[PDB]
Scaffold this active site. Structure first.
Site, PDB file in Angstrom:
ATOM      1  N   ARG A 177       0.892  -1.325  -0.135  1.00  0.00           N
ATOM      2  CA  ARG A 177      -0.220   0.261   0.180  1.00  0.00           C
ATOM      3  C   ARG A 177       0.930   1.838   0.014  1.00  0.00           C
ATOM      4  O   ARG A 177       0.942   1.797   0.561  1.00  0.00           O
ATOM      5  CB  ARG A 177      -0.760  -0.018   1.814  1.00  0.00           C
ATOM      6  CG  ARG A 177      -1.566  -1.672   1.484  1.00  0.00           C
ATOM      7  CD  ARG A 177      -1.964  -1.126   2.124  1.00  0.00           C
ATOM      8  NE  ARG A 177      -1.521  -1.771   3.942  1.00  0.00           N
ATOM      9  CZ  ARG A 177      -1.017  -2.405   4.220  1.00  0.00           C
ATOM     10  NH1 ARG A 177      -0.868  -3.613   3.696  1.00  0.00           N
ATOM     11  NH2 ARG A 177       0.217  -2.658   5.271  1.00  0.00           N
ATOM     12  N   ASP A 242       3.222  -8.176   7.420  1.00  0.00           N
ATOM     13  CA  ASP A 242       1.847  -7.612   6.088  1.00  0.00           C
ATOM     14  C   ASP A 242       0.442  -8.294   5.873  1.00  0.00           C
ATOM     15  O   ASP A 242       0.225  -7.628   4.505  1.00  0.00           O
ATOM     16  CB  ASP A 242       2.383  -6.789   5.281  1.00  0.00           C
ATOM     17  CG  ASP A 242       1.493  -5.677   5.253  1.00  0.00           C
ATOM     18  OD1 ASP A 242       1.012  -5.524   3.817  1.00  0.00           O
ATOM     19  OD2 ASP A 242       0.990  -4.785   5.935  1.00  0.00           O
ATOM     20  N   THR A 243       0.539  -9.624   6.414  1.00  0.00           N
ATOM     21  CA  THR A 243      -0.501 -10.174   6.001  1.00  0.00           C
ATOM     22  C   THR A 243      -1.797 -10.446   7.658  1.00  0.00           C
ATOM     23  O   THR A 243      -2.658 -10.058   7.884  1.00  0.00           O
ATOM     24  CB  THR A 243      -0.501 -10.989   5.758  1.00  0.00           C
ATOM     25  OG1 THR A 243       0.467 -12.399   6.668  1.00  0.00           O
ATOM     26  CG2 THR A 243       0.230 -11.945   4.477  1.00  0.00           C
ATOM     27  N   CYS A 348      -1.084 -20.115  -0.331  1.00  0.00           N
ATOM     28  CA  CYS A 348      -0.060 -19.407   0.625  1.00  0.00           C
ATOM     29  C   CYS A 348       0.377 -20.174   1.636  1.00  0.00           C
ATOM     30  O   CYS A 348       0.268 -21.640   2.117  1.00  0.00           O
ATOM     31  CB  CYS A 348      -0.551 -18.293   1.506  1.00  0.00           C
ATOM     32  SG  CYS A 348      -0.132 -18.305   2.798  1.00  0.00           S
ATOM     33  N   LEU A 349       2.247 -20.402   2.118  1.00  0.00           N
ATOM     34  CA  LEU A 349       2.384 -21.332   2.502  1.00  0.00           C
ATOM     35  C   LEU A 349       2.633 -21.147   3.843  1.00  0.00           C
ATOM     36  O   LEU A 349       3.384 -21.918   5.342  1.00  0.00           O
ATOM     37  CB  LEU A 349       3.937 -21.250   1.768  1.00  0.00           C
ATOM     38  CG  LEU A 349       4.503 -21.878   1.134  1.00  0.00           C
ATOM     39  CD1 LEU A 349       6.094 -22.282   0.824  1.00  0.00           C
ATOM     40  CD2 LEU A 349       4.299 -23.458   0.732  1.00  0.00           C
ATOM     41  N   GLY A 350       2.374 -19.777   4.892  1.00  0.00           N
ATOM     42  CA  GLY A 350       1.823 -19.499   5.901  1.00  0.00           C
ATOM     43  C   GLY A 350       0.527 -19.709   6.188  1.00  0.00           C
ATOM     44  O   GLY A 350       0.442 -19.375   7.408  1.00  0.00           O
TER      45      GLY A 350
HETATM   46  C1  HEM Z   1      -3.615 -13.639   7.064  1.00  0.00           C
HETATM   47  C2  HEM Z   1      -2.460 -14.252   6.284  1.00  0.00           C
HETATM   48  C3  HEM Z   1      -2.239 -14.551   4.843  1.00  0.00           C
HETATM   49  C4  HEM Z   1      -3.068 -14.367   3.479  1.00  0.00           C
HETATM   50  C5  HEM Z   1      -4.570 -14.756   3.797  1.00  0.00           C
HETATM   51  C6  HEM Z   1      -2.114 -14.695   2.842  1.00  0.00           C
HETATM   52  C7  HEM Z   1      -2.241 -14.549   1.293  1.00  0.00           C
HETATM   53  C8  HEM Z   1      -1.969 -15.110   0.765  1.00  0.00           C
HETATM   54  C9  HEM Z   1      -1.987 -14.838  -1.536  1.00  0.00           C
HETATM   55  C10 HEM Z   1      -3.182 -14.889  -1.300  1.00  0.00           C
HETATM   56  C11 HEM Z   1      -0.749 -15.819  -2.078  1.00  0.00           C
HETATM   57  C12 HEM Z   1      -0.684 -16.479  -3.098  1.00  0.00           C
HETATM   58  C13 HEM Z   1      -0.356 -14.940  -3.756  1.00  0.00           C
HETATM   59  C14 HEM Z   1      -0.437 -15.977  -6.262  1.00  0.00           C
HETATM   60  O1  HEM Z   1      -0.559 -16.926  -5.980  1.00  0.00           O
HETATM   61  O2  HEM Z   1       0.525 -14.884  -6.756  1.00  0.00           O
HETATM   62  C15 HEM Z   1       0.134 -16.144  -0.846  1.00  0.00           C
HETATM   63  C16 HEM Z   1       1.384 -16.776  -1.266  1.00  0.00           C
HETATM   64  C17 HEM Z   1       2.570 -16.951  -0.371  1.00  0.00           C
HETATM   65  N1  HEM Z   1       2.437 -16.891   1.840  1.00  0.00           N
HETATM   66 FE1  HEM Z   1       1.261 -16.503   2.538  1.00  0.00          FE
HETATM   67  N2  HEM Z   1      -0.513 -14.983   3.241  1.00  0.00           N
HETATM   68  C18 HEM Z   1      -0.813 -14.894   3.951  1.00  0.00           C
HETATM   69  C19 HEM Z   1      -0.453 -15.115   5.515  1.00  0.00           C
HETATM   70  C20 HEM Z   1       1.361 -15.574   5.134  1.00  0.00           C
HETATM   71  C21 HEM Z   1       2.745 -16.018   6.163  1.00  0.00           C
HETATM   72  C22 HEM Z   1       2.642 -15.487   7.913  1.00  0.00           C
HETATM   73  C23 HEM Z   1       3.827 -15.862   5.805  1.00  0.00           C
HETATM   74  C24 HEM Z   1       4.979 -16.630   5.901  1.00  0.00           C
HETATM   75  C25 HEM Z   1       5.603 -16.036   7.343  1.00  0.00           C
HETATM   76  C26 HEM Z   1       3.324 -15.952   4.250  1.00  0.00           C
HETATM   77  C27 HEM Z   1       4.135 -17.009   3.132  1.00  0.00           C
HETATM   78  C28 HEM Z   1       3.610 -17.003   1.719  1.00  0.00           C
HETATM   79  C29 HEM Z   1       4.707 -17.350   0.792  1.00  0.00           C
HETATM   80  C30 HEM Z   1       6.098 -18.314   1.286  1.00  0.00           C
HETATM   81  C31 HEM Z   1       3.412 -17.379  -0.780  1.00  0.00           C
HETATM   82  C32 HEM Z   1       4.138 -18.288  -1.297  1.00  0.00           C
HETATM   83  C33 HEM Z   1       3.941 -18.585  -2.206  1.00  0.00           C
HETATM   84  C34 HEM Z   1       4.805 -19.791  -3.966  1.00  0.00           C
HETATM   85  O3  HEM Z   1       4.086 -17.999  -4.410  1.00  0.00           O
HETATM   86  O4  HEM Z   1       4.482 -20.807  -3.770  1.00  0.00           O
HETATM   87  N3  HEM Z   1       1.855 -15.752   3.701  1.00  0.00           N
HETATM   88  N4  HEM Z   1       0.030 -15.702   0.875  1.00  0.00           N
END
Ligand code: HEM
Ligand SMILES: [K+]
Length: 405
Positions: A177, A242-243, A348-350
């Protein structure tokens, strides 16, 4: 303002939605994005804002696009194009098959097994912060809990000093943002500038922290490079700061205005996990996209190679064709359909860490401060971007209605 309409883009499919400042923002971000699902809006539209790009407005198309990486590449997932072009985080900037190997490594730091291990830690921090606030009868949720709770967990797991949070948090927010002080590219280089020395140091002397694990990890059996480690740690940093931070605020804002829903969870705590999912659907907040690898006709629309298409993860679950009365929160909803954590090979991995942090927060908070509301006079404001959030969340409560646990 508005980029001239490319020749191949049909005039009648133009809908100038500005993902960084949607027209109806004052009614709430989700509500603001939901305008794209109003009666006369087609399944796929083109906005001349932010350089010009397509936008899939329905869960059906969003899911289909995310499944077809051959046509919709993660190579350029950010808008505007400049940001999408500079974007090189791993594994998000990569499509299968090469993407796979890096996901496996990322799972060594955030996978379910690792999350269960963090259970006690997560709970202790939540209880600590909540119990400390409890007697005060007030707090600005964003800075007193939403930010410190998940960020400290991440910083600890990553083995990074908390003094660095203010700088890092600023950089991550400029990537989701931006306020104008810097381009996505600049925030990224600064994030990488921060990690480079830390990675080299962790590679020379292997530790047990997330950085060490990634930096000394292997992909497909071969040693990861310093650049690859940097590109991956940077992304983990983004997820950790930031999630969940933002999601918690959307959720608490809602609970602070829903005594009935609070009583449900207070009465039957075992329903918290289910409530967590419904909230993840209703307050979905992420929205990035893909880039066309070649000319492709999608649902009667001619997409051209190089065209960017926003596929809002947030919209799938708000889609009435997926969930009746989508704007209503129903902890009992029979089929909670959503793509909040993405869809396809980039799931999402997290997500496991995120649910844990959300459920623990709900369980620990409602058990100590069951009754609370939004500070009177407060005009809660939302902010829109790749990841939407809440500016400030002033909450108040009668200390006499609380309980130490
Ligand atoms: C409410 C919490 C969260 C939401 C709604 C969320 C949502 C997402 C979404 C929508 C994607 C897909 C992006 C795409 O397809 O371009 C993503 C990917 C990812 N997120 Fe989460 N995220 C959250 C929390 C987190 C946290 C806390 C971490 C790490 C500590 C994390 C690590 C990642 C990673 C490493 C990916 C990449 C997966 C890939 O590209 O294969 N996320 N996330
Ligand atoms: K790129």
């Amino acid at each position: 303002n508005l980029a001239p309409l490319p020749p191949h883009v049909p005039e009648h499919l133009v809908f100038d939605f500005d993902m960084y400042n949607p027209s109806n923002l004052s009614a709430g971000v989700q509500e603001a994005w939901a305008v794209l699902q109003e009666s006369n809006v087609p399944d796929l539209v083109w906005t001349r804002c932010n350089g010009g790009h397509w936008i899939a407005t329905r869960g059906q198309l969003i899911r289909e696009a995310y499944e077809d990486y051959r046509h919709f590449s993660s190579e350029c997932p950010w808008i505007p194009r400049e940001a999408g072009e500079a974007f090189d985080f791993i594994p998000t900037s990569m499509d299968p098959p090469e993407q796979r190997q890096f996901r496996a490594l990322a799972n060594q730091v955030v996978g379910m097994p690792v999350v269960d291990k963090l259970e006690n830690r997560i709970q202790e921090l939540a209880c600590s912060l909540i119990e400390s606030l409890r007697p005060q009868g007030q707090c600005n949720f964003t800075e007193d809990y939403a930010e410190p709770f998940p960020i400290r967990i991440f910083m600890l797991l990553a083995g990074l000093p908390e003094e660095d949070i203010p700088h890092l948090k600023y950089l991550t927010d400029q990537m989701t943002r931006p306020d104008g002080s810097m381009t996505f590219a600049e925030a990224k280089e600064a994030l990488y500038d921060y990690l480079i020395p830390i990675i080299e140091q962790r590679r020379q002397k292997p530790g047990t922290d997330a950085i060490s694990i990634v930096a000394n990890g292997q992909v497909n059996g071969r040693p990861i490079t310093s650049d690859e480690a940097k590109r991956m740690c940077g992304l983990l940093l983004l997820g950790g700061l930031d999630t969940v931070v933002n999601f918690l605020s959307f959720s608490m804002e809602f609970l602070a205005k829903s005594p009935e829903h609070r009583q449900e969870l207070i009465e039957r705590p075992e329903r918290i996990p289910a409530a967590c999912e419904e909230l993840l659907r209703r307050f979905s907040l992420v929205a990035d996209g893909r880039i066309l690898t070649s000319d492709y006709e999608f649902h009667g629309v001619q997409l051209k190679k190089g065209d960017q298409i926003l596929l809002p993860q947030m919209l799938s679950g708000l889609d009435e064709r997926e969930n009746a009365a989508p704007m209503h929160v129903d902890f009992s909803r029979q089929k909670v359909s959503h793509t909040t954590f993405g869809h396809g090979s980039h799931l999402c991995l997290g997500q496991h860490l995120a649910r844990r942090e959300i459920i623990v927060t709900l369980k620990e908070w409602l058990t100590r401060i069951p009754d609370f509301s939004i500070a009177p006079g407060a005009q809660i404001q939302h902010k829109s971007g790749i990841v939407s959030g809440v500016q400030a969340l002033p909450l108040v409560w009668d200390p006499a209605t609380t309980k130490a646990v």
